[PDB]
Ligand SMILES: CC(=O)Nc1cc(S(=O)(=O)O)cc2cc(S(=O)(=O)O)cc(O)c12
């Protein structure tokens with residue numbers, strides 16, 4: 001118990017430099033501050049599930065995931081997928097609090113890093129589609145500091 | 147799942163105006179922002195347990211309680227009491243984060259309120275021992291806004 005519980009915060013953020021798959025799903029593991037990010041063409045229940053399938057392979061199974069009241073997060077589909085995995089689903093607290101700052105900071109840091117890396121490579125606008133995956137993996141690696 | 151999980155933050159804060167029992171155990175329920183506070187002569191494993199016994203009667207059984215690495219919180223006694231109740235015990239996270247701000251804010255608000263109420267009653271220093279209980283209950287009621 002000496003540590004923090006395994007609770008994630010997940011959201012989607014739009015990054016046109018990564019079009020056609022410009023919807024970035026971002027998960028922060030509040031226990032490690034580790035960040036996992038995947039690319040999606042659309043924000044659907046199935047994109048959220050695919051994102052978490054990847055995050056589970058990378059981080060392990062959390063006890064709970066905190067999102068907002070987004071439809072992709074509150075659909076019957078998504079409710080059932082989390083039940084199948086045994087993962088509790090939670091939401092932001094009270095006390096003039098917003099959704100969840102940590103994953104929001106992560107959105108920003110993530111977008112700044114992609115921008116820095118892309119321009120360094122000579123992409124001032126959209127990143128060529130064949131380069132996007134390696135550049136995203138590089139931004140994730142950097143953010144995770146290791 | 148539509149709500150936040152039942153996770154508490156608990157700490158002790160020293161309030162000489164409430165001497166001889168000047169150790170205040172404070173629990174914030176992060177799901178409701180409700181505050182429970184009890185008075186203790188000393189900071190021991192048994193004081194923490196007595197405090198939580200009271201907080202359970204008032205708030206219900208939480209899923210987890212977050213404290214610091216205090217001995218009263220990490221003793222075998224306390225570890226066993228939480229196990230007996232089925233309550234997970236957790237700690238502060240990483241990312242340059244401190245222990246737990248919400249319960250720290252609550253310490254301050256609580257001490258300011260006691261001070262305001264005591265002086266209003268004419269107690270500029272220690273609160274007479276026979277008055278302390280009702281004044282503490284009144285400060286808790288106020289803080290919980292209701
Ligand atoms: C378990 C726990 O303690 N969680 C938390 C601790 C603190 S803190 O201020 O005390 O650091 C703030 C929190 C803020 C939010 S949010 O609704 O704004 O997104 C959610 C939490 O879950 C928080």
Ligand SMILES: CC(=O)Nc1cc(S(=O)(=O)O)cc2cc(S(=O)(=O)O)cc(O)c12
Nearest residue numbers: 007100101102238239243244245246247
């Ligand atoms: C479950 C959850 O999200 N918890 C939390 C959310 C956020 S927030 O910045 O995202 O609001 C901040 C937190 C800070 C701490 S602490 O180590 O500083 O005490 C602990 C938490 O548990 C927090």
